[PDB]
């Protein structure tokens, strides 16, 4: 889950201001411009900071987890209530935090989104750089930092 | 006709109670859904490019560019609105992702399902399929004997 | 070699005609611009002033730059720099752009593409030249191109 709901018996350690933005919740872009299109679609699964594929089947067409030649955008966003997750199409420049396979994407590594939405080094059907080490956050969730600019002809 | 309002007078009145099934007509210029954050252009029209894929076509040199029916590897975007008087279409770049009613051929129309990837010809019409980012939202719909429009989303081209 | 070098005069010149007053290297951003246009900035290493700029990362010390370059790497185009700070402003492959660019030393309608060193060269297609080549020096000519993003051929 983007934010999971559990109460503890503690505050979390946090006063650091540096190495404190490497989150799962940490929802968004690194760096975001006003102009940059977001679109709402309706969800199935965990998309979260995922690369996303349209399915249509009565109801409208939702979005899922995807890559490959069917990926129409990654999703930066989840609202749980209305099951709604935000897309920034791929026609959109991006930079941010994303699921990484595993840990052994390093920097300036070309990535491609998988089956599952994961990044994972190089075949590639769009222009992802990793700008970041592989960063391990929950039991086998890595996160790593892409700039994802666009296709990338043949 | 071959125009975005029918040139054709209505012997009727305001006769549409219902809600549903009334958007689909020629003149629903502009996409179904629409961001405010889109990039916007207008060019020359040659010809009649409305609701087709367009590319840019130059002449002798005298006079500036211009915007024809194509498609193919000279897609340049998409005309989603014509002005008739100043002879004005308005067009949104390939870059930028479309969602809307457009042109498709009358050769197959049947075939056309959601789902199915589409290409651009070279009059700038849709058609079933290989280097631009098309998939049809619906089923084809026939407002003329010959003319067929489908509700398709555009995201850019494609490798290969 | 600079955007706007300033130099002093005795002199002052005269502006006899309205026309052809657009062809100087000091001509920053696009001929056409639109309000929802994305611009960014990076640090600048080199000059990479009116060329296809490529992401650049040095030892992980400093933060990665932007460098003349193009072809699989083309990462946007540089359509100004400040001189004071050291920062190119990039507008991204992703955006579609219309301004004056370095050409390599071609009519309009000819495809061009981005080499090595971020000039475009006639035939990936990536721009289309929309007028002649305008010398600005003996090793400097920039071309009116309009920029749609990459396709294959």
Known sequence: MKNPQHDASL??????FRDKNVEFFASGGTRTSKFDKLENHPFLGYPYKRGVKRV????????????????????????????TATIVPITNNFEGYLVAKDSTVKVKDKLIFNKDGALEKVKA????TALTDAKQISNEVYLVKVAVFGNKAM | ALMKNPQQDSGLLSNSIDFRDQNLIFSNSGGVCTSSKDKIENYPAKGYPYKRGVKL???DGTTELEVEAGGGDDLYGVCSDIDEFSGMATVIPITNNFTGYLTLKKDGQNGVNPGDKLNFNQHGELEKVKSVNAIALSKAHKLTEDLFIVLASVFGNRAI
């Open chain 2, 57 to 59: 076509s130059f002449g």
């Open chain 1, 125 to 128: 059907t769009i222009n992802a």
């Open chain 1, 11 to 16: 505050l979390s350690n946090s006063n650091e």
């Open chain 1, 56 to 83: 249509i089947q009565h109801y409208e067409p939702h979005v899922e987890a995807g890559g490959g030649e069917d990926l129409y955008g990654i999703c930066i966003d989840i609202d749980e209530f209305s099951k």
